[PDB]
Curated annotation (Swiss-Prot):
Family: Belongs to the protein kinase superfamily. Tyr protein kinase family. JAK subfamily.
PTM comment, free text: Phosphorylated. Phosphorylation by JAK1 at Tyr-165 and Tyr-166 induces kinase activation.
Protein function: Tyrosine kinase of the non-receptor type involved in numerous cytokines and interferons signaling, which regulates cell growth, development, cell migration, innate and adaptive immunity. Plays both structural and catalytic roles in numerous interleukins and interferons (IFN-alpha/beta) signaling. Associates with heterodimeric cytokine receptor complexes and activates STAT family members including STAT1, STAT3, STAT4 or STAT6.
Endpoints of the signal sequence: none
Assembly and binders: Interacts (via FERM domain) with JAKMIP1. Interacts with PIK3R1; this interaction is important for cell migration. Interacts with MPL/TPOR.
Residues of the Protein kinase domain: 8-287
Residues at which ATP binds: L14, G15, E16, G17, H18, F19, G20, K21, V22, K41
Name recorded for this polypeptide: Non-receptor tyrosine-protein kinase TYK2
Portion of the full-length sequence here: 890 to 1176 of 1187
Pathology noted in the entry: Immunodeficiency 35: A primary immunodeficiency characterized by recurrent skin abscesses, pneumonia, and highly elevated serum IgE.
Species for this entry: Homo sapiens (Human)
Impact noted for substituting K41R: Complete loss of catalytic activity
Tissue spec: Observed in all cell lines analyzed. Expressed in a variety of lymphoid and non-lymphoid cell lines.
Residue positions of the active site: N134 (proton acceptor)
Length: 289
């Protein structure tokens, strides 16, 4: 699929991803205004070869993924000004849950349905031999009150069939407050590491993405702000001591125990995304009416 820059009409900026900005565009070749709304993710024109290779990877991965709980790849547009490809994705009407939840009081059963859907999209992603490496409520988009879609794949990587992990490197933009201890210490990302991040994402939905209850806030309240280059080391240590994010207000005790099970120090003790699907289907059924 191909898109033409001449027919793209900018509405407003949607935000910042891993490898650039996301903008709301009205693709209208008829010139009336009835054209379909598209989310266009662009690579910054000033980025070096280290990001240009990572951006091409993001497009390639999203183009090969097809699932109801994963943002749809619409096509590619030739960016004449940046000499790269502009990622054309579907416009998810309600946006990210990080922006949606603090302003819209969403029921317990409804949030449980979202987590179930995240697990469904994540199980497919793992079946296609890919790790997300950036699972957070910030990267979970809402299409309607009963439908959720996984957003950005800037940090997503292909796990080669022979191995169960992918070796990561030192980076300042790493979502460390959503990362398992094995990613922070041994620099290894397993399929179980995405399950740890889901547990954190589930914690966010249950707090209604309240920034004062957010993972960086709660962990920095424990670590402190005057720890030099040892913020991640102090994070690794508290996670080893068995310290975890607190139970959100009105969150059921059994749901918090599922969270803690996604937060097992040992990667092998953590449930897979396939194990979580029938479990969340039942928990959602219990809390619905
Ligand atoms: N960090 C980060 C981060 C993560 C993601 Cl996944 C996005 C993103 O792609 N958001 C999208 C995509 C498509 N439609 C909408 N929809 C809306 O924004 C509607 C409210 C208007 C939002 C952004 Cl911008 C920043």
């Amino acid at each position: 699929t191909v898109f033409h820059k001449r027919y793209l009409k900018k509405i407003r900026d949607l935000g910042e991803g891993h490898f650039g900005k996301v903008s709301l565009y009205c693709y209208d070749p008829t010139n009336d205004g009835t054209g379909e709304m598209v989310a266009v993710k662009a690579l910054k024109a000033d980025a070096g070869p280290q990001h240009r290779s990572g951006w091409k990877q993001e497009i390639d991965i999203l183009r090969t993924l097809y699932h109801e709980h994963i943002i749809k790849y619409k096509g590619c547009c030739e960016d004449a000004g940046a000499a790269s490809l502009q990622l054309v994705m579907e416009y998810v009407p309600l946006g990210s849950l990080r922006d949606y939840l603090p302003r819209h009081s969403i029921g317990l059963a409804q949030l449980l349905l979202f987590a179930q859907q995240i697990c469904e999209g994540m199980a497919y992603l793992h079946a296609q031999h890919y790790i997300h490496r950036n699972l957070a409520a910030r990267n979970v988009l809402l299409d309607n009150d009963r439908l959720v879609k996984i957003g950005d794949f800037g940090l997503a990587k292909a796990v080669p069939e022979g191995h169960e992990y992918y070796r990561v490197r030192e980076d300042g933009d790493s979502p460390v407050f959503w990362y398992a201890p094995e990613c922070l210490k041994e620099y290894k990302f397993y399929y179980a590491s995405d399950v740890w991040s889901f547990g954190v994402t589930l914690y966010e939905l249950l707090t209604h993405c309240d920034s004062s209850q957010s993972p960086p806030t709660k962990f920095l309240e424990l670590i402190g702000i005057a720890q030099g280059q040892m913020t991640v080391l102090r994070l690794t240590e508290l996670l080893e001591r068995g310290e975890r994010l607190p139970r959100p207000d009105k969150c059921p005790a059994e749901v918090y125990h599922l969270m803690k099970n996604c937060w097992e120090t040992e990667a092998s003790f953590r449930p897979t995304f396939e194990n979580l699907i029938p479990i969340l289907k039942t928990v959602h059924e219990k809390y619905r009416h």
